[PDB]
């Protein structure tokens, strides 16, 4: 006669991830490589967003 035993499936080989590009960086060099610094008392308070 005819009978059914089970199923068969192909497995994926690798994985890939994508994202909308990386051009939009936070300005960080101007803080680390700054022309001048702040004093021991008082300090500049910068906001990054």
């Amino acid at each position: 006669g005819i009978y059914q035993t089970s199923n068969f499936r192909v497995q994926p080989t690798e994985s890939i991830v994508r994202f909308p590009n990386i051009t939009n960086l936070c300005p960080f060099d101007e803080v680390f490589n700054a022309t001048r610094f702040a004093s021991v008392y008082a300090w500049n308070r910068k906001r990054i967003s």
Binding site: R36, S39, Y41, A42, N44
Partner: protein
Amino acid sequence: QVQLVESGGGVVQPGRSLRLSCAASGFTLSSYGMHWVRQAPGKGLEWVAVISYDGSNKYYVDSVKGRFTISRDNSKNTLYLQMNSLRAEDTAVYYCARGWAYWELLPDYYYGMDVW
């Protein structure tokens, strides 16, 4: 070139009012502080008033409190001193000075008046 023009000088009846004008060329007043210094013949220089780069606060000397006013205009790059209720001891030569900038961050009670 950094050049400052002091105009409006004159001799007026005591107790009257007059407005002194200063012209700044080569830079912008909005980023710097100004000093007004008077010097009488036969005497030493006498500090009068200052204006900060941001215009948040104003300081005068005790001899000029409540009688003169200082003002600035960023649009035309012009500096105005309002002299009111003049007294005979005010005979001096007034100089308009330029102080350091917020461009160069320095501690409080700022240091200024390097060229005028």
